[PDB]
Amino acid sequence: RYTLNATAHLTMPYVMPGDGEVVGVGEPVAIRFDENIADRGAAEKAIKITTNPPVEGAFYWLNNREVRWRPEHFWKPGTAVDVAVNTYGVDLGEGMFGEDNVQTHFTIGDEVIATADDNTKILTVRVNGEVVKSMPTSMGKDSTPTANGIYIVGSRYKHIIMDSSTYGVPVNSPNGYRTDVDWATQISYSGVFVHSAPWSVGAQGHTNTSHGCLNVSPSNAQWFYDHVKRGDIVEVVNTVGGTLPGIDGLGDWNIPWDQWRAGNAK
């Protein structure tokens, strides 16, 4: 027990969520190393997770330095999770060892699930199974459509600039953009946000005009930004698009329990 808490040569682990955070029902526990991990099974073995009420869960790797852990279903509101990353000096393979141990405790807030349905072009926000907000929306147009699936709410911004080059699409090109936006809530690592779009209010509710983001009105975007937290859920249904890769970053729930469970330790 020479521990360090997770605030929100060798390899350091970094665990999300951070100590004390309150997170939405889809927040997976995340352990991310600063080095690639030859011996996944080892790293998994060194990570103890307790939950109360107890719930079964399992590890799946998003890449070679990041493991994730989650239940089969969304968390039940109330659950406390404690994470013990007992990795100090542990054999992680090919001459790499855990630099230290790491701890975190977190808790699960309300069930918040927002469904965007391309049939109606409404994004309906549900807190504990009840409709508290209904927002006309406008998504990827057919030629750059919004992927179907379940997205985990990641970070939030009062203002930023989305630049398509970040995703290997030049600004000068036909799907290019470098756009200033307010009240931006990120929901995929591939660049999908729910955000203020005063330029598509006319279209919100009628027609997809965006590059992929869920355009909503300025006050609904602000509302989304005020009431939403990491781990809350946006589900997108019925678009002409594909499915959001399970290994996106915020795609976890699109892998099915069974593929997930089986893990990918090797």
UniProtKB/Swiss-Prot annotation:
Disruption phenotype: Inactivation of this gene leads to altered colony morphology and growth, attenuation of persistence and increased susceptibility to amoxicillin-clavulanate both in vitro and in the mouse model during the chronic phase of infection. Loss of both ldtMt1 and ldtMt2 results in phenotypes that are unique and/or severe compared to the single mutants lacking only ldtMt1 or ldtMt2. One of its GO terms (cellular component) is peptidoglycan-based cell wall. Its main location: membrane. Is irreversibly inactivated by the beta-lactams carbapenems via the formation of a covalent adduct resulting from acylation of the catalytic Cys. The keyword Lipoprotein applies. Transmembrane segments: none annotated. Keywords: Acyltransferase, Calcium, Cell membrane, Cell shape, Cell wall biogenesis/degradation, Lipoprotein, Membrane, Metal-binding, Palmitate, Peptidoglycan synthesis, Signal, Transferase, Virulence. The keyword Cell membrane applies. Its EC number is 2.3.2.-. Monomer. This is L,D-transpeptidase 2. The lineage of its organism: Bacteria, Bacillati, Actinomycetota, Actinomycetes, Mycobacteriales. The gene is ldtB.
